[PDB]
Write a protein that binds this ligand. Structure first.
Ligand code: ATP
Ligand code: K
Ligand code: K
Ligand code: MG
Ligand code: MG
Ligand code: MG
Ligand code: MG
Ligand code: MG
Ligand code: MG
Ligand code: MG
Ligand code: MG
Ligand code: MG
Ligand code: MG
Ligand code: MG
Ligand code: MG
Ligand code: MG
Ligand code: MG
Ligand code: MG
Ligand code: MG
Ligand code: MG
Lengths: 19, 103, 112, 81, 174, 156, 53, 118, 134, 105, 189
RNA sequence: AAAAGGGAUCAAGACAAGUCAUCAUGGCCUAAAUAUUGUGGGCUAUAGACGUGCCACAUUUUCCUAAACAAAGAGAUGCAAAAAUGUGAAUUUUAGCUAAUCUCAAAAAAUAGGAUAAAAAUAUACAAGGAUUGUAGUCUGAAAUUCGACUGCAUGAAUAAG
């Protein structure tokens, strides 16, 4: 019922090259 | 309607002042200057009523106050006629006839 | 960067930004049907709230080259992007010179 | 997303709830257009203002706003000194 | 601090309430300058019902002008203040309508008709030429000058208990 | 005006019908025959083209009574897909006669033009050639348009 | 003066006959994205390709 | 007359009198008159005393004047405390809705405050 | 059209299409001076009435083969046909096959052409490339 | 003397009495309003523009019946074709002639 | 180039007459009128559309109610003024497919009009999609017929009598003089 | 018909006039950076002050009602009817046309009626005006916070014609 896990689930580390 | 018109020559009266000179004006120029004085007095009057006849009845009353000789445009006519009378001699003024005749 | 072809396939006036805008037109041609599906799932209020949130998150991860709003016409002769005419692919000035010399068919000086 | 009928703008953020009592470093983000959902009311953010990361502690009053509304990009204009 | 240029800040008694409204609604029925038309006859009680009078201008009786003036039969849009004596033409429709009103009240009947036409065909004056025939023949004239005063929400209104109807006290008094 | 929904609002903020007004409900009943005047009389209604709305019901009823009187079995009918009609207005104007006004005949135009000239308001020779000039500029004798061209002109 | 519930029976037949979407409630079905024709191939062929020299 | 402690002259529309209270406009005013069968062109001198008493009772229930300025002043004060961009603009007396500040920011400087006039 | 028995009506001068552009004479700041350009399209219309369907196609074939440079043409063809369109198309197959017997020589390809792949998707995208993109 | 413009009476089409007289001025100047029936059909232009066009139309049509009226219509001004036309807007100008504010400094 | 076309118009054109065919009017069965577009060697996206137009009264197999139901199902494709159902199709890649669909669709429009389930007789034909044009015509009463000429003579002679009797009786009003005489008689004070 | 009108065009030279940031080019410079790529930000800052524009400061204005009259241009990178829903922006759904055919699309002022006045200055009569701001929405687009265009409600600044 909760959609919160989607945000963190798709949160791939190093998304932005560098920082 | 006035019978004359005042036109000044720039800087020919000494001390920077202009030399005013009267000149006659044709009929069309006489009527335009006249009816433009009436519309000037009309636009300065206070409103009286309502409807579409507001402006028309305001101009028509000034046309009746003119024939009755009790309108403010008569003073505007006699005022420009005094200028001509006070400047009736400038027509043959020395300055006009001497623009560049004294090299 | 990864969308720039390793071999230049441009025959017009090449430029840093002309080569950049050509790579966005090729990247969008390949991913337009994919981007149209994500935009259809987001606007379909009949689907579950989860299906719309997934498509809404994936549309954000798409590379900027895939967006159509990044495309902007450029001058094939000068490479400028300010003051372009869609009918000739050139700036207002390059269109003037070529039109006077007769290199643009049909165009003539207008007087009326 | 302005129009309400298509939800708020959500961005992939590493919004992982902390283990009870564990120390979590603030979330560094450049997504200044990410609506402040209720699911991270209480977390510590570090929003990018173009040059620096200005810290932010989301509360129940910030729900609905954007993360960029709390990080000033320009500096106040002051005449003289 | 702002140092631009800014302009510096710097009559007769006004009219009474209702004076302006009564100015665009006054009805002038006579013009002293206009000449008295020779041979202009007045309207007899049965003149508006004679087919021979068609095409002739007749004057309204002095006592009828006060009644028609009491119920706002005249209107500022109409040109009455250009002549001396208010007189109305007798057209073919005036006889048709009047001849029906002469037979209706004679046999206890009631005629119900609508007057339709183009912009200024004369519908409102046709009503005046029915009220004129009514006053002269001892009728009860109940005329509603303008029907827009009852619909445009410009007069008081109150409901009737246990009914969907609504009254208009200020208008019914006037 | 009385053949449409009025501008009054009831406590529920809903527009009241012009026929629900007591005074308008009286003239309407007499015009339709509901209220019978024992001593007889006449109930005459006059339309206006200055500051007047358009009611398809009144105009339709007007066209239906004129067709029946003129002996025409193809009387107009409602527009099946229009929603600007009023059943109440149809019932009121169901059995009312109609007087269609138009321009005055040539003979009537002369009698009126001669009255304006005798008063000094029309400095013209009133002859047949001159009576037919005003009868043409006034849309085939519309009295009102005949005055704008004769009395309210800027030529005299 | 035609019942709305009765008009839909005709509006429904046209969709079946002409294979159109029957949405009497005006629900947001995102069909506006399906009717939009792709403009990809039109934009790609803007800069002429490298040719014989 | 007196409506909610405010004195109005006889030659004054009731529509315009109710519309002078912060929070009441052409919409709410039109519904108050219809509730008590007052034609829009009703002037102050025409209202019966009982109807005037009614109007005050209705207005008191409504959220007007001080109550409406609380909601507006609380929203502006909340934007300042949270530290939002808009809050800073209100405090500094500058345009709040993304307007060019090079010129023509007079009304912003004059009115934009944390405690607005209303 | 006279030799083919086609009664032609025209040429009808249709409204000329005028496009307009106002560009600055300079490539820089000088905007107070501009100039107008235009591309006037002149067009005619030759309508043929009571013309046999096939005969009207030979007319258009003769005009395309002997087309004059600098002229574009667009022809709308009308024809009357009975009901049951689908059934007629199938029957014609053998009639059209006999006419193409000698015309198949134009196209020649290796056995099981693999460069094409999906036949329909090829024509769809090959026509896009040929037609400039649309 | 019945005049119909676009199927409508002169008073139903032209709401300005000045335009009605200008339309039939040819018949008025020659005193022939009560001897001809005119059925006009106009297109394009404004109220006065259409009125002045009808003046020249009736004049030419009237001369087909009585060619000897041209000298009279000449002095009435119903034979001349007014060639005045709205000027075009010119680049660098706000309107045909009007120009933007010129700043000296 | 003019000589090249003068050579074609003198030697090659006359050969076209050997392969021409005479025009034959369409029989009663040919009730459809298709339209196909050609750009003469060009590739244009609009050369795939096929338009078809037929008349509901051409289908003699459909009765009155069945024909009126076909005008309702047609919807905005029906022209009440001309009484023609015009419909196009550019859904497919080839003209052949756009024509086959319209050929099958018209077979469904006729199969649905024959369906006795619902005749839609309660529904009146809606024509709000079409903008009807009103055409004005010259009044036939103004035609100067030998009979109307007599009507004009009577109208012109009856006008001279009215003016004559008024002049003889000294009654022709002349407002120009009525004011002059009045002002020139000390009557205005 | 005619006393016609407008547009384009308008030299050499000078102003070392403008542009090495369209393009092109001589010389001189950068070549792990004065080159190339992405995320976010900025070009939208604001004490004072200068330029063009819009609009308003009611009485020939504005507001309400009604059954008039245009031209030109746009739609294959698309103009969208009719119908239905919503106070509204707009939405649902596509008929037709890729066009003297179909659509945008409706002209407005005007003409003719009607309403409002102590229409701001005597505090119990604060006119017209629509800036500023609160709030709820809609459309385009990954994305509308810095920083978009429209809609509803509420708020109601200066402004007496300079
Ligand atoms: N029979 C008549 N005799 C004299 N004058 C007349 C006559 N009929 C009409 N008029 C005048 O014609 C003008 C218009 O007439 P009237 O006011 O009756 O028209 P109306 O049908 O009521 O117009 P509207 O639809 O605008 O209300 C007035 O000046 C009127 O005096
Ligand atoms: K106000
Ligand atoms: K915004
Ligand atoms: Mg007006
Ligand atoms: Mg009237
Ligand atoms: Mg400034
Ligand atoms: Mg102009
Ligand atoms: Mg020359
Ligand atoms: Mg030179
Ligand atoms: Mg220099
Ligand atoms: Mg310089
Ligand atoms: Mg320089
Ligand atoms: Mg360089
Ligand atoms: Mg960037
Ligand atoms: Mg800038
Ligand atoms: Mg305004
Ligand atoms: Mg629509
Ligand atoms: Mg538009
Ligand atoms: Mg004032
Ligand atoms: Mg000024």
């Amino acid at each position: 019922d909760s959609l919160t896990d989607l945000i963190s689930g798709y949160a791939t580390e190093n998304m932005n090259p560098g920082l | 309607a006035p019978l004359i018109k005042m036109r000044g020559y720039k800087g020919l009266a000494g001390g920077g002042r202009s030399l005013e000179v009267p000149q006659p004006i044709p009929a069309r120029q006489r009527r335009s200057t006249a009816f433009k004085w009436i519309l000037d007095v009309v636009n300065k009057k206070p409103s009286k009523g309502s409807g579409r006849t507001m402006f028309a009845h305001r101009v028509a009353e000034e046309i009746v106050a003119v024939v009755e000789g009790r309108s403010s445009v008569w003073d505007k006519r006699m005022l420009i006629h005094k200028l001509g009378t006070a400047n009736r001699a400038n027509l043959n003024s020395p300055a006009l006839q001497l623009k560049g005749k004294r090299f | 960067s990864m969308f720039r072809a390793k071999k230049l396939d441009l025959g017009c006036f090449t430029n840093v930004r002309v080569l950049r805008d050509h790579s966005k037109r090729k990247a969008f041609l390949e991913a337009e049907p994919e981007r149209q599906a994500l935009r259809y799932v987001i606007r379909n209020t009949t689907l579950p709230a989860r299906t719309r949130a997934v498509a809404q998150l994936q549309l954000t991860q798409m590379h900027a080259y895939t967006r159509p709003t990044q495309i902007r016409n450029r001058c094939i002769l000068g490479g400028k992007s300010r003051g372009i005419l869609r009918d000739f692919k050139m700036t207002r000035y390059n269109f003037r010179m070529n039109a006077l010399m007769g290199n643009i068919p049909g165009v003539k000086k207008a007087s009326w | 997303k302005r129009s309400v009928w298509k939800g708020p703008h959500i961005v992939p953020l590493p919004i992982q709830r902390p283990e009870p009592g564990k120390k979590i470093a603030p979330i560094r983000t450049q997504a200044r257009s990410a609506t402040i959902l209720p699911n991270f009311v209480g977390l510590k953010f570090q929003v990018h203002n173009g040059k620096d990361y200005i810290d932010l502690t989301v509360t129940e009053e910030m729900v609905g706003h954007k993360l960029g509304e709390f990080s000033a990009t320009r500096k106040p204009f002051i005449w003289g000194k | 601090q702002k140092l631009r240029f800014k302009k510096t800040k710097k009559s007769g008694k006004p009219p009474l309430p209702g004076e302006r409204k009564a100015y665009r609604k006054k009805i002038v029925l006579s013009n002293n300058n206009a000449l008295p038309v020779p041979g202009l006859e007045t309207l007899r009680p049965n003149d508006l019902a004679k087919q021979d009078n068609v095409g002739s201008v007749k004057a309204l009786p002095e006592d009828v002008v006060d009644a028609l003036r009491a119920m706002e039969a005249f209107k500022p849009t109409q040109c009455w203040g250009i002549f001396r004596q208010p007189s109305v033409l007798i057209r073919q429709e005036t006889v048709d309508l009047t001849k029906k009103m002469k037979a209706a009240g004679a046999d206890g009947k009631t005629i119900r008709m609508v007057i339709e036409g183009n912009r200024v065909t004369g519908k409102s004056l046709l009503l005046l030429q029915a009220m004129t025939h009514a006053f002269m023949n001892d009728w009860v004239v109940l005329h509603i000058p303008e029907a827009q005063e009852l619909t445009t929400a410009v007069t008081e209104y109150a409901p009737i208990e246990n009914s969907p109807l609504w009254t208009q006290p200020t208008y019914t008094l006037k | 005006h009385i053949m449409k929904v009025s501008d009054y609002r009831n406590p529920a903020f809903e527009l009241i019908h012009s026929h629900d007004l007591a005074l308008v409900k009286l003239f309407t009943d007499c015009l339709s025959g509901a209220t019978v005047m024992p001593n007889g009389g006449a109930v005459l209604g006059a339309t206006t083209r200055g500051n007047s709305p358009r009611s398809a019901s009144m105009e339709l009823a007007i066209a239906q009574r004129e067709a029946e009187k003129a002996g025409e079995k193809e009387v107009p009918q409602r527009d099946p897909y229009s929603k600007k009609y009023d059943d109440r207005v149809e019932a009121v104007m169901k059995s009312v006669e109609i007087l269609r006004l138009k321009g005055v005949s040539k003979t009537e135009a002369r009698g009126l033009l001669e009255y304006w000239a005798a008063s000094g308001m029309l400095k013209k020779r009133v002859d047949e050639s001159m009576v037919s000039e005003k009868w043409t500029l006034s849309g085939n004798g519309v009295v009102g348009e005949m005055e704008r061209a004769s009395l309210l002109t800027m030529k005299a | 003066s035609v019942p709305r519930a009765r008009l839909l029976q005709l509006v429904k037949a046209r969709c079946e006959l002409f294979s159109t979407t029957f949405n009497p409630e005006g629900i947001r079905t995102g069909n506006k994205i399906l009717r939009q024709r792709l403009k990809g191939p039109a934009l790609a062929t803007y800069y002429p390709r490298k040719n014989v020299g | 007359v007196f409506i909610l402690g405010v004195n109005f002259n006889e030659h004054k529309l009731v529509q315009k009198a109710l519309e002078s209270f912060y929070g009441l406009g052409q919409q709410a005013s039109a519904r108050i008159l219809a509730k008590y069968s007052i034609h829009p062109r009703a002037k102050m001198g025409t209202l019966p005393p009982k109807i005037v008493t009614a109007l005050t009772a209705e207005l008191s229930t409504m959220t007007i004047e001080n109550d409406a300025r609380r909601l507006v002043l609380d929203n502006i004060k909340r934007l300042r405390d949270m530290g939002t961009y808009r809050g800073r603009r209100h405090a500094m007396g500058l345009p709040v809705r993304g307007q060019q500040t090079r010129n023509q920011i007079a009304n912003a400087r004059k009115l934009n405050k944390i405690e607005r006039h209303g | 059209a006279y030799y083919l028995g086609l009664p032609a009506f025209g040429p009808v001068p249709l409204p000329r299409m005028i496009e307009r552009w106002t560009v600055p004479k300079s490539h820089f700041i000088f905007k107070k001076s501009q100039e107008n350009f235009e591309r006037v399209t002149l067009r005619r219309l030759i309508q043929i009435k009571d013309g046999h369907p096939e005969t009207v196609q030979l007319w258009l074939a003769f005009l395309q083969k002997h087309a004059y440079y600098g002229i574009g043409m667009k022809a709308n063809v009308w024809e009357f046909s009975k009901l049951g369109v689908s059934k007629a198309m199938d029957e014609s197959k053998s009639e059209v096959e006999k006419l193409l017997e000698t015309r198949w020589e134009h196209l020649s390809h290796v056995s099981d052409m693999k460069g094409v792949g999906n036949f329909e998707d090829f024509l769809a995208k090959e026509r896009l490339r040929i037609s400039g993109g649309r | 003397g019945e005049v119909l413009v676009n199927g409508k009476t002169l008073a139903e089409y032209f709401g300005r009495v000045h335009d009605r007289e200008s339309a039939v001025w040819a018949l008025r100047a020659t005193n022939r309003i009560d001897k001809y029936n005119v059925w006009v059909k106009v297109e394009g232009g404004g109220t006065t523009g259409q009125a002045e066009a009808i003046t020249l139309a009736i004049a030419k049509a009237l001369l087909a019946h009585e060619p000897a009226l041209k000298p009279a219509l000449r002095r009435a001004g119903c034979v001349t074709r007014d060639p005045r036309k709205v000027e075009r807007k010119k680049h660098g100008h706000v309107k045909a002639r009007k120009m933007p504010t010129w700043v000296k400094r | 180039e003019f000589r090249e076309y003068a050579r074609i118009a003198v030697w090659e054109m006359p050969l076209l007459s050997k392969y021409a065919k005479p025009f034959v009017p369409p029989t009663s069965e040919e009730v459809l009128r298709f339209r196909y577009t050609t750009y003469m060697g060009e590739f244009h996206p609009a050369d795939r559309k096929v338009v078809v137009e037929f008349c509901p009264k051409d289908l003699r197999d459909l009765s009155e109610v069945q024909q009126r139901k076909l005008m309702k199902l047609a919807g905005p494709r029906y022209n009440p003024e001309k009484d023609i159902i015009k419909m196009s199709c550019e859904k497919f890649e080839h003209q052949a497919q756009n024509k086959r669909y319209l050929g099958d669709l018209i077979e469904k429009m006729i199969a649905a009009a024959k369906d006795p389930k619902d005749t839609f007789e309660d529904i009146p034909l809606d024509t709000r999609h079409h903008t009807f044009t009103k055409k004005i015509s010259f009044p036939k009463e103004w035609l100067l017929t030998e009979e109307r000429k007599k009507e004009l003579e009577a109208a012109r002679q009856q006008a001279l009598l009215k003016d004559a009797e008024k002049v003889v009786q000294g009654a022709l009003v002349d407002g120009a003089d009525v004011v002059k005489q009045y002002l020139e008689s000390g009557a205005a004070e």
